[PDB]
Design a binder for this molecule. Structure first.
Ligand SMILES: [Mg+2]
Ligand SMILES: [Mg+2]
Ligand SMILES: [Mg+2]
Ligand SMILES: [Mg+2]
Ligand SMILES: [Mg+2]
Ligand SMILES: [Mg+2]
Ligand SMILES: [Mg+2]
Lengths: 131, 185, 262, 141, 58
RNA sequence: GGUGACCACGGGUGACGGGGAAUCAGGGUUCGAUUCCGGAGAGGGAGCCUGAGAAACGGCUACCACAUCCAAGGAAGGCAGCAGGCGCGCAAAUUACCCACUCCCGACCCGGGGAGGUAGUGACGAAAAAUAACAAUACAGGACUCUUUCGAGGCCCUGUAAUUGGAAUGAGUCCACUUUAAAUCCUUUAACGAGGAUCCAUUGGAGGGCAAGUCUGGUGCCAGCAGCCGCGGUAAUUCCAGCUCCAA
């Protein structure tokens, strides 16, 4: 916080997804890489936006510390962020719950769905006994 | 299938015969003078020199004012004067063949940081670079074989985080100071 | 194989796509369309690898489903639609239109065009004939066919199709002294004036064409695309004006630009 | 003299591949008789079972008892003789052990004063013979 | 066969076992190259021994 | 009638073809199962249904060879797909996570994909690069210097052993951050982390080829070494060892 500055380059705004995307780099001389939460509050401060619609990712620290470059995408509204954004970035900010079922379990369950023909009760009940 | 690259090459060539007293003595002269780790390092820079000479030979056998010769000859000359192994007044393809291995080893970062007074010996230069105390421009380099360029020549200096530029002395210093103050009243 | 291929390998992709080996194993296999996949540019790589509007395949699909791109004035929801050559890619939300023209180095360029100049398109007639009821028909390189063409148009000529109507505004005859652009082969992306056409019966004709700098180069007849009358082009040209520079001069051009910027 | 005509390439090429059969290396590498006769079957190494321990007299100028083993290969069941190349490594060998056997070093030709032994023992009972000789690891007792 | 395998490993068994003496750790890597570079190039003395070898037993 | 010494036909192939790989004066010689393109096959043959496209095999039918369950009346097979096994061998990995990326399929902005991505085993191989540096004492060495050998120091580099002797760093422990679909690794960065810095560099050699010992003890044509010359029958520069050197 004492000596940490943010700069933005390759900035361009596209209304196609109603967002403004840019490449951001943070200059932290003596600290570690700055956390994403601090980056979002600084970027929202610079662009006069709320620090809950911002997304930052892809942060790589250069060798020897100092600068760290990532990609920052901001939006003109939160609703558009729901419309077009990767679900993992949404879940990072807590705006999207995640499925908690194993892919292997889903394949076994679906294979048991294929085994049962027609009958809805047994089709949805095939995953009950062999848990 | 997979999106891997599989693009690699060897940077060195082993000598055709082993155990020649003349060759072994000459290579050990280069290792001792420029603080090289092993014989592979002098073989790799000999190999890069040989590749440059091979390209220069092929261009020389090519006809005069050939567009391919002029373009690639000027390109190769530009790289040589950029890394400082070839004099700027000596912009000739013939003069490339006169290059040796001594001036290629001269341009290494280990040699340079010794010859700019930042290191007491060539071995002190290598261990300092490996310990990450020397930076070029704004980026700190820990590679002894970093071939420096003429533009980057003037900008070699101690890194800020090292206990030779900015603050933050090393853990040996902090531990020794702690024991000194803790060992008395 | 047993049927048509619906996959495209990344390295097997056309060179002008500028795709890289590391990102993925595959490539955007272009769907069937008005242009051959070997000479097209799929819309996905247009909005992602050229205009940087989208980042991956999912994002570029999002604009298509929001129905913002109008290839030839028609909304296309196909992510891998083969655009092709001299097509007005119009995004009216940003009010920006592009004509997909080859540059100097034989690759599709980001050629911005004014909205008024974006209402028409040049096309090369590939064959003419007469169908039922004695109706003359004409087909173009853009695969679009029109009924009732002007009888003066012969094959390998040029027509000025009009968007939103699909009619002919003007036509250009193919003869010596016309401004053309090479659309295939080594000289792809070059502009010159037709100087000579050698006819080889039973084989492909060879057309010799001279650019504005005096450099004269040959090509096949099928690679010839007339784009103007005399010396004046009928469309806006991409940067470089369709000239070809040998490796000596674009080197010092880059050095001069670096010197001026420094 | 050799024909140098501009249209003699057929005779030059036919004469080359005809005369190439007259040198040993090309003949053995393409006829296939050497491959069939090789107990290893073109393999660098091959495993076998120690039939018995044997001693072979050296050649005329030398005088020693080279320590070898008769070993039949687990593939194709051929009985061969393998040298045991150290000071006391025959003691490590014993009856009915699985031994890795390599060539001796000059491609099916006998080496040194050992008469008619083309092979040497590399590993015995899955542990390296050099490891046993230098005491890095021991026979599983 | 003659049954002369009894003598196998005779000399290696008979050789008395003397342990390796303890010595300082040898320099390795770049420092080892430095040591042998100094041992034969910077201390060159012209002597009537006809350039004795590095392992001379004199 | 057609094809053949301008090599037909036949046989062999440890032959899928090519783009390419290795070696590299030039010319050539080998290798191309292997990620790209084309072909062929799905235990061996054969015949079919549907479909635009199959002679499909994670479609069917029959025979041949194996082989599964049976209440012996019957039924069900195709891992040269990803894992994982047995066998074969000199010879080759996890019965892992995920559609986030590249794309593909679908009625489709939403579903699916052992395609593919990620991680694990991984000294096939390739790139980079630690295992130490510095200072001052002693004794040599240097064109050293001062009287012209004799002694010292106004100088330079190594060496040997030392409370030296206090500077620097990782390899590791380990916080957070970062990456990522979730992780891991890497890069940052807190706190520890070096004086046998015991935080320990090995593999092969020392007669010649071919760099390096006419050292010491044992053996005594034996054991063994030795790619080739050759060594070994009593003080073996060649074996077995110790020390010391050499090569990477
Ligand atoms: Mg075959
Ligand atoms: Mg192949
Ligand atoms: Mg098939
Ligand atoms: Mg159909
Ligand atoms: Mg079938
Ligand atoms: Mg170590
Ligand atoms: Mg010895």
């Amino acid at each position: 916080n004492d000596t940490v500055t943010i700069r933005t380059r390759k900035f361009m705004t596209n209304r196609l997804l109603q967002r403004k995307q840019m490449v951001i780099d943070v200059l932290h001389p003596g600290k570690a890489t700055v956390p994403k939460t601090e980056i979002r509050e600084k970027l929202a401060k610079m662009y006069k936006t709320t620090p809950d619609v911002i997304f930052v990712f892809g942060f790589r620290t250069h060798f020897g510390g100092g600068k760290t470059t990532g990609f920052g995408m901001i939006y003109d509204s939160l609703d558009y962020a729901k419309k077009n954004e990767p679900k993992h970035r949404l879940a990072r900010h807590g705006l999207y719950e995640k499925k908690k079922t194993s892919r292997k379990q889903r394949k076994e369950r679906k294979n048991r769905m294929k085994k049962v023909r027609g009958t809805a009760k047994a089709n949805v009940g095939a995953g009950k006994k062999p848990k | 299938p997979v999106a891997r690259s599989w693009v690699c090459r060897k940077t060195y060539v082993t000598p055709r015969r082993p155990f020649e007293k003349s060759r072994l003595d000459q290579e050990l002269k280069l290792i001792g003078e420029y603080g090289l780790r092993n014989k592979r390092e002098v073989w790799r820079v000999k190999f890069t020199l040989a590749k440059i000479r091979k390209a220069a030979r092929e261009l020389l056998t090519l006809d005069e004012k050939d567009p391919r010769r002029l373009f690639e000859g000027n390109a190769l000359l530009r790289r040589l004067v950029r890394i400082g192994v070839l004099d700027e007044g000596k912009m000739k393809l013939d003069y490339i063949l006169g290059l040796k291995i001594e001036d290629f080893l001269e341009r290494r970062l280990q040699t340079q940081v010794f010859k700019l007074g930042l290191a007491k010996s060539i071995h002190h230069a290598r261990v300092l670079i490996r310990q990450r105390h020397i930076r070029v421009r704004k980026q700190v380099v820990n590679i002894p074989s970093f071939i420096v360029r003429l533009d980057s020549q003037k900008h070699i200096d101690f890194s800020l985080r090292s206990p030779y530029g900015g603050g933050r002395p090393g853990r040996v210093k902090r531990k020794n100071a702690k024991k000194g103050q803790g060992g008395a009243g | 194989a047993r049927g048509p291929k619906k996959h495209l390998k990344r390295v097997a992709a056309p060179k002008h796509w500028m795709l890289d080996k590391l990102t993925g194993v595959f490539a955007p296999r272009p769907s069937t369309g008005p242009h051959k996949l070997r000479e097209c540019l799929p819309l996905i790589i247009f909005l992602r690898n050229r205009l940087k509007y989208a980042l991956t395949g999912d994002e570029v699909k999002k604009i298509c489903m929001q129905r913002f791109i109008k290839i030839d004035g028609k909304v296309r929801t196909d992510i891998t639609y083969p655009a092709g050559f001299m097509d007005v890619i119009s995004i009216d939300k940003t009010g920006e239109n592009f004509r997909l023209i080859y540059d100097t180095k034989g690759r599709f360029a980001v050629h911005r065009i004014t909205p008024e100049e974006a209402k028409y398109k040049l096309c090369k007639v590939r064959k003419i004939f007469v169908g039922t009821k004695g109706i003359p028909h004409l087909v173009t390189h853009d695969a679009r066919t029109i009924r009732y063409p002007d009888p003066l148009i012969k094959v390998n000529d040029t027509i000025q199709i009009d968007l939103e109507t699909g009619k002919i505004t003007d036509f250009i005859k193919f003869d010596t002294g016309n401004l053309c652009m090479v659309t295939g082969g080594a000289n792809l992306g070059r502009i010159g004036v037709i100087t000579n056409r050698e006819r080889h019966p039973g084989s492909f004709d060879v057309v010799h064409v001279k650019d504005a700098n005096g450099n004269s180069f040959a090509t096949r007849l099928s690679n010839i695309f007339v784009i103007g009358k005399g010396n004046k082009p009928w469309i806006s040209l991409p940067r470089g004006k369709g000239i070809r520079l040998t490796i000596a001069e674009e080197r010092d051009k880059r050095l001069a630009a670096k010197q001026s910027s420094g | 003299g050799k024909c140098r005509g501009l249209r003699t390439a057929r005779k030059l090429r036919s004469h080359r591949r005809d005369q190439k059969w007259h040198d040993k290396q090309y003949k053995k590498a393409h006829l296939g008789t050497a491959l069939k006769a090789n107990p290893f079957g073109g393999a660098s190494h091959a495993k076998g079972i120690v039939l018995e321990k044997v001693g072979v007299e050296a050649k005329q100028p030398n005088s020693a008892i080279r320590k070898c083993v008769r070993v039949q290969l687990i593939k194709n069941g051929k009985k061969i003789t393998a040298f045991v190349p150290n000071d006391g490594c025959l003691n490590f060998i014993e009856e009915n052990d699985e031994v890795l056997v390599a060539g001796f070093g000059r491609k099916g030709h006998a080496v040194g004063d050992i008469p008619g032994v083309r092979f040497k023992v590399v590993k015995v009972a899955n542990v390296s013979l050099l490891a046993l000789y230098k005491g890095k690891k021991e026979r599983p007792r | 066969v003659h049954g002369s395998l009894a003598r196998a490993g005779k000399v290696r068994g008979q050789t008395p076992k003397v342990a390796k003496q303890e010595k300082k750790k040898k320099k390795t890597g770049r420092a080892k190259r430095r040591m042998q570079y100094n041992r034969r190039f910077v201390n060159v003395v012209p002597t009537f021994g006809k350039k004795k070898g590095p392992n001379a037993n004199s």
